Amino acid sequence: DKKWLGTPIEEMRRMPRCGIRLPLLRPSANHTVTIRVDLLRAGEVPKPFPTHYKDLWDNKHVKMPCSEQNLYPVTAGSRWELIQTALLNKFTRPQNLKDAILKYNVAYSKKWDFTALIDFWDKVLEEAEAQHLYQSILPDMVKIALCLPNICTQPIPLLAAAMNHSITMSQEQIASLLANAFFCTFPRRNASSYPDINFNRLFEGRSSRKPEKLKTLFCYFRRVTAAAPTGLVTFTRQSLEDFPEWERCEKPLTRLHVTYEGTIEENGQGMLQVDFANRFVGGGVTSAGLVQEEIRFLINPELIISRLFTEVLDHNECLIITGTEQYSEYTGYAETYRWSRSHEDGSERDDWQRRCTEIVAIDALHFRRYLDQFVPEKMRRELNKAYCGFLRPGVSSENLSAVATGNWGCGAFGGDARLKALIQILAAAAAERDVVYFTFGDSELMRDIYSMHIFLTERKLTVGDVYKLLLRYYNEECRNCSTPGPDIKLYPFIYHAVESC
Numbered sequence: 001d002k003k004w005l006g007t008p009i010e011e012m013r014r015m016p017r018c019g020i021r022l023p024l025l026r027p028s029a030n031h032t033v034t035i036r037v038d039l040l041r042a043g044e045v046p047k048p049f050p051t052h053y054k055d056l057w058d059n060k061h062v063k064m065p066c067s068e069q070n071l072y073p074v075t076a077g078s079r080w081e082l083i084q085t086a087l088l089n090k091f092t093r094p095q096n097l098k099d100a101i102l103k104y105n106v107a108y109s110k111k112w113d114f115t116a117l118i119d120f121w122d123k124v125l126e127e128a129e130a131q132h133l134y135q136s137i138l139p140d141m142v143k144i145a146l147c148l149p150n151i152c153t154q155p156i157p158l159l160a161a162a163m164n165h166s167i168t169m170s171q172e173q174i175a176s177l178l179a180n181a182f183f184c185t186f187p188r189r190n191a192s193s194y195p196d197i198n199f200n201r202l203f204e205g206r207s208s209r210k211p212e213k214l215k216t217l218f219c220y221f222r223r224v225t226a227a228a229p230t231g232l233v234t235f236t237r238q239s240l241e242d243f244p245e246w247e248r249c250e251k252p253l254t255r256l257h258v259t260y261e262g263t264i265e266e267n268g269q270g271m272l273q274v275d276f277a278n279r280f281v282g283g284g285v286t287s288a289g290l291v292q293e294e295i296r297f298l299i300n301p302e303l304i305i306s307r308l309f310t311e312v313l314d315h316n317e318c319l320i321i322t323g324t325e326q327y328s329e330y331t332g333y334a335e336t337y338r339w340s341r342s343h344e345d346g347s348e349r350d351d352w353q354r355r356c357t358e359i360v361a362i363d364a365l366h367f368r369r370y371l372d373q374f375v376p377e378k379m380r381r382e383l384n385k386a387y388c389g390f391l392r393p394g395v396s397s398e399n400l401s402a403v404a405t406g407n408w409g410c411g412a413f414g415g416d417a418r419l420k421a422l423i424q425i426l427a428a429a430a431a432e433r434d435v436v437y438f439t440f441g442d443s444e445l446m447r448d449i450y451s452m453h454i455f456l457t458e459r460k461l462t463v464g465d466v467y468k469l470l471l472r473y474y475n476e477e478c479r480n481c482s483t484p485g486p487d488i489k490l491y492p493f494i495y496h497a498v499e500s501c
């Protein structure tokens, strides 16, 4: 019968109800705020601050396509003026859009393949859908792109490695920026520690995934150019310098809800939603990937702009994004992913007019050899990564939502689900958060995670006791194991070890 086990999900803390009343929104050395805070009002489009466009062109800020420093060889010409010229033409065929984008990307005229764009327009859409795309959606997208200097007036700092810094910007500013990314306008982003931002890889090859990606993104573009979204989104890079001594951590485990049904994004509303991220945030979203991270970034595209400014994550870092809106629904996953329909996001907004949706990008390690992940160094790494993603310095536990997650770094990256579940349970306990864990049809893993959790909680083991058990497993079954897998599985080992004692 049972579709879930443990603590009822109803009993887990959610935003906005668990939330702290926010401090007043204001810019500081660690918080860039790109709108008029004095004028922020529910239901109104935020007004950019400053009033007039200010340009920085340096290695600490985004290089804006509308910068006077964005030049091209004629004698230098203004590449911004060239962009305007190229994009302010009627498109009636996909080649027209390709050629427009190539006018200010001349160096890529042989490298960039547009097959997926051509096939989407010509071979996937119905004739009327194609016509709507080129008569309405694309010209609307061009106009919001070309409005960039009136919309994004404030230089945007890069979130570079080791910085602890936030950027709070409007959904409207994001929309403008992403339309630019679609038209591949961001300079010096094509030719190494930053993800791709321009959408050029979205247009290449013949993956059956590409039409679904494109439909999902057009769903967003149609929505945000028809009526400006009125909210804000904050991006925070978080870097911890000190990590727990896990073997000494005396904290108790927290509560668990575990289910083989539901999704993170729908069932975990209001909770801290894990993005199973690439270290290059968004991974394959505007190229060939389509698993958990790429899906979330497609259905909540404001996530994608993190790639404009977020340097590759180091082992002690994460990215926390608050306020992204869901614009699409889907079915399937990976090679069966399909766009279903438009989504009307019902989420409340906090006092900064952010949707009460908090997502954290934590990248797992890739394990070439399965046993490599049980090495103490590798276990501590994953614990500390997840801990960084879950910890909110200067917030009490009662104000912290549950963590909504699942088999983080399992699948392509070769992670063990039962290990990673326990790692996350320990990270969460240390950060004083409950765990809501989704196994996506895998009912045996639901029961196993549940049985281990209740076992350890009833015997009141601490984070440190459990971590020492993981060390014993490494020392006794892994370190001098003759074979690809060890003699005894982790969970059975832990049950025998504690029941022994």
Ligand SMILES: Cn1c(=O)c2c(ncn2CCCC(=O)O)n(C)c1=O
Binding pocket: 263, 264, 292, 332, 333, 334, 335, 406, 440
């Ligand atoms: C993280 N995650 C999943 O793992 C998931 C899934 N749906 C099926 N699955 C299971 C994997 C199915 C597949 O491998 O194609 N969803 C929606 C998901 O978020």
